Amino acid sequence: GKKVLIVYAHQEPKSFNGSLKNVAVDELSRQGCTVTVSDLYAMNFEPRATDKDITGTLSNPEVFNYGVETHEAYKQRSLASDITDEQKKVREADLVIFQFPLYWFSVPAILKGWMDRVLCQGFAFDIPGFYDSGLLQGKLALLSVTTGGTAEMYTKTGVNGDSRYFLWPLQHGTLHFCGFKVLAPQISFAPEIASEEERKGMVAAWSQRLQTIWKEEPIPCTAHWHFGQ
Amino acid sequence: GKKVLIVYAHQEPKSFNGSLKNVAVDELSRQGCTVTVSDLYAMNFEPRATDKDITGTLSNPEVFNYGVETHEAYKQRSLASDITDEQKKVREADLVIFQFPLYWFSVPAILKGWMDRVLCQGFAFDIPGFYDSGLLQGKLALLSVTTGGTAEMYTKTGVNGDSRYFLWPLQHGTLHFCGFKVLAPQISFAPEIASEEERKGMVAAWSQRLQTIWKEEPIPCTAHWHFGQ
Ligand SMILES: Cc1cc2nc3c(=O)[nH]c(=O)nc-3n(C[C@H](O)[C@H](O)[C@H](O)COP(=O)(O)OP(=O)(O)OC[C@H]3O[C@@H](n4cnc5c(N)ncnc54)[C@H](O)[C@@H]3O)c2cc1C
Ligand SMILES: Cc1cc2nc3c(=O)[nH]c(=O)nc-3n(C[C@H](O)[C@H](O)[C@H](O)COP(=O)(O)OP(=O)(O)OC[C@H]3O[C@@H](n4cnc5c(N)ncnc54)[C@H](O)[C@@H]3O)c2cc1C
Ligand SMILES: COc1ccc2c(c1)C(=O)C(c1ccc(N)cc1)=[N+]2[O-]
Ligand SMILES: COc1ccc2c(c1)C(=O)C(c1ccc(N)cc1)=[N+]2[O-]
Ligand SMILES: [Zn+2]
Ligand SMILES: [Zn+2]
């Protein structure tokens, strides 16, 4: 069997992102996978990294260091329950799909907060214990992104540069760092500009890709893959 | 005269980031600049992009589109006061310094939320009306970042790649997109590993640089600057 967590970041159920998340649930459910969705806006997910994330006696209450305190809280089981609830979903998953609209060449802040707070030291990585030695080794991750900009804008000679350039902090700096193997991104370009048929086509391309997702190999998550030369 | 806004994202006043923000206030105040600080954690700044960002009635209450709603709310003066308070600070500033610890090769979510919610359509850019036609042309921006990783890790052949690789979404996709001219980043590597004297040196280098900040030329914010030789 296979277990999938979809971390979804869109405010509107009727959105293009909503449709891509729903087709993923529908297709992976049809295959017999175990599927969980973390709908961050509906959960009112807390994005801020604060001292409210630790319940116990702080390691250094005089000078608050978020990374030190969360690492110690993870080991002591004194983290806030909203974080540990997400960590259980990630621990059980074989594949984590992130479904989101691109905001400033990155994830919306609510989803950035999920990465900041859930992927803590001791859970997702250790120093040492990162990149190929990351604690989430054996798991797959996939970014399914939608954009305002067209595919042409997202080219080497386009005004936004190649789309792989903006993937570096997410695929490499975050997911590969935690040990994930990264599947090729799904980028659904400019659905707002797209015709009704073109939008339908992008939703079906995603559903069709998911039919054979378990046969895919991960990308080589390197600087050469992202930037060339 | 010169006006500066510092957007600061650290939970702890006694932190290394706190010291870099304080020396920036001290030095720019000494020069006679007008200085404002947005201390996002102390403000409990809201990072989530939600329908609470629009006061009164929505353009389309049946299907919520954040970008459409905020663009229309900006034009109709119906944005939440926390957003318009930041927009006034940015509008008045000649230079915007962002002071933050690197979180997942990017800004902490609270600061990502400031970028998502404050730099709205009609205020910072329009569609079309971006990059050289962005609405913050004439302003300068500067990223002052601290890291966990050493300078050696942030090299082309280092495990994290060149530090310029992670700057692309922030400097190009966000700041340049809105029309800012981007000053060279200030990167304070691994202060937690550094000695007491080493950290004092990093703080002093930032204060010293600020003495001549108004004489600096911006970087060429291009793909070649970020990814080339
Ligand atoms: C703060 C902010 C920052 C941004 N920064 C960037 C950036 O850096 N770069 C960039 O390129 N873009 C950026 N954008 C734009 C953003 O990425 C796009 O608006 C977003 O990706 C569009 O996806 P969506 O789901 O919201 O589209 P929607 O507006 O929800 O979808 C478009 C259309 O598809 C229709 N649709 C829904 N479901 C289906 C279906 N099943 N079949 C057919 N049609 C369907 C909808 O009804 C609608 O008409 C930014 C936006 C914001 C708000
Ligand atoms: C969610 C998360 C994600 C992260 N992702 C990344 C990543 O992608 N890449 C990466 O490289 N790092 C990453 N980090 C690490 C993070 O960037 C560093 O921990 C941070 O930059 C350290 O800066 P600081 O201000 O918090 O240091 P502090 O711990 O506050 O500073 C270290 C010391 O400086 C002392 N000090 C304060 N002021 C002075 C002064 N004036 N003179 C001398 N000493 C002084 C303090 O007392 C303290 O002992 C991440 C951390 C977290 C929590
Ligand atoms: C905040 O940054 C952004 C917001 C919305 C955006 C973008 C950046 C785009 O680049 C884009 C966009 C939409 C249509 C065409 N023709 C081009 C770009 N939208 O919507
Ligand atoms: C979330 O990603 C991160 C968090 C903290 C980090 C890093 C990444 C490092 O790479 C690092 C780090 C710590 C000690 C030595 N010797 C090197 C790097 N810290 O602290
Ligand atoms: Zn990688
Ligand atoms: Zn640029």
**CB spacing of B106 vs A119 below 8 angstroms:** no
CA distances from A12 to A17, A96, B5 (A): 8, 21, 34
**Three-class DSSP labels, chain B:** CCEEEEEECCCCCCCHHHHHHHHHHHHHHHCCCEEEEEECCCCCCCCCCCHHHECCCCCCCCCCCHHHHHHHHHHCCCECHHHHHHHHHHHHCCEEEEEEECECCECCHHHHHHHHHHCCECCCECCCCCHHHCCCCCCEEEEEEECCCCCCCCCCCCCCCCHHHHHHHHHHHHHHCCCCEECCCEEECCCCCCCHHHHHHHHHHHHHHHHCHHHCCCCCCCHHHHHCC
State the DSSP code for A50.
Answer: -
What does the alpha-carbon distance between residue A173 and residue A119 come to, in Å, rounded to a whole number? 12
Token pair for residue A216?
């895919």
A167 alpha carbon to ligand 5 midpoint, in Å?
10
- Which bound ligand lies closest to the C-alpha atom of B201? 2
Indicate the SS3 state at residue A22: helix
**CB spacing of B49 vs A108 below 8 angstroms:** yes
Q: Residues with Cβ < 8 Å from A28, sequence gap 6 or more?
A: A2, A4, A35, A210
For residue A128, say if its preceding peptide bond is cis, omega within 30 degrees of 0.
yes
What does the alpha-carbon distance between residue A155 and residue A162 come to, in Å, rounded to a whole number? 4
**Three-class DSSP labels, A165-205:** HHHHHHHHHHHHCCCCEECCCEEECCCCCCCHHHHHHHHHH
Within its chain, how far is the Cα of B18 from the centroid? 15
The residue assigned the tokens 């913050």 is B136
Q: Residue A186 burial by CB count (10 A; 0-12/13-18/19+): exposed, middle or buried?
A: buried
CB count in 10 Å sphere of residue B133: 11
What does the alpha-carbon distance between residue A107 and residue B109 come to, in Å, rounded to a whole number? 10
Ligand 1 environment, Cβ below 6 A = A 10, 15-17, 19, 101-105, 146-149, 191-192, 199-200, 203; B 49, 65-67, 116, 173
CATH class for the region spanning B1-229: alpha beta
What does the alpha-carbon distance between residue B228 and residue B165 come to, in Å, rounded to a whole number? 10
- Which bound ligand lies closest to the C-alpha atom of B105? 2
Token pair for residue A92?
């059980």
Final resolution, Å: 1.5
CB count in 10 Å sphere of residue A193: 12
Token pair for residue B6?
């510092």
Q: What are the extents of the domains in chain A?
A: 1-229
Token pair for residue B221?
């914010």
Burial B17-54 (b: 16+ CB within 10 A, else e): bbbbbbbbbebbeeeebebbbbbbbeeebbbbbeeebb
Q: Residues with Cβ < 8 Å from A63, sequence gap 6 or more?
A: B12, B14, B15
What does the alpha-carbon distance between residue B18 and residue B39 come to, in Å, rounded to a whole number? 10
Identify the helix (H) or strand (E) that includes residue A100. strand A95-101
What does the alpha-carbon distance between residue A191 and residue B67 come to, in Å, rounded to a whole number? 14
**CB spacing of B110 vs A47 below 8 angstroms:** yes
Query: Cβ(A24)–Cβ(A6) under 8 Å?
Result: yes
Indicate the SS3 state at residue A47: coil
Query: Cβ(A9)–Cβ(A108) under 8 Å?
Result: yes
Closest listed residue to residue A108, CA positions, set A41, A193, A183, A185: A41
Token pair for residue B65?
């589109």
Token pair for residue B211?
């003495």
Token pair for residue A156?
């080497």
Q: Indicate which of A54, A152, A227, A229 best probes the interface with B, i.e. most B CBs within 10 Å of its own CB.
A: A227
Burial A79-100 (b: 16+ CB within 10 A, else e): bbebbbebbebbeebebbbbbb
Ligand 2 environment, Cβ below 6 A = A 49, 63, 65-67, 116, 173; B 10, 12, 14-17, 19, 101-105, 146-149, 191-192, 196, 199-200, 203
Closest listed residue to residue B109, CA positions, set A123, A66, A11: A66
CA distance B32 to chain A (A): 31
What does the alpha-carbon distance between residue A50 and residue A64 come to, in Å, rounded to a whole number? 9
- Which one-letter amino acid corresponds to residue A216? E
The residue assigned the tokens 């250094």 is A60
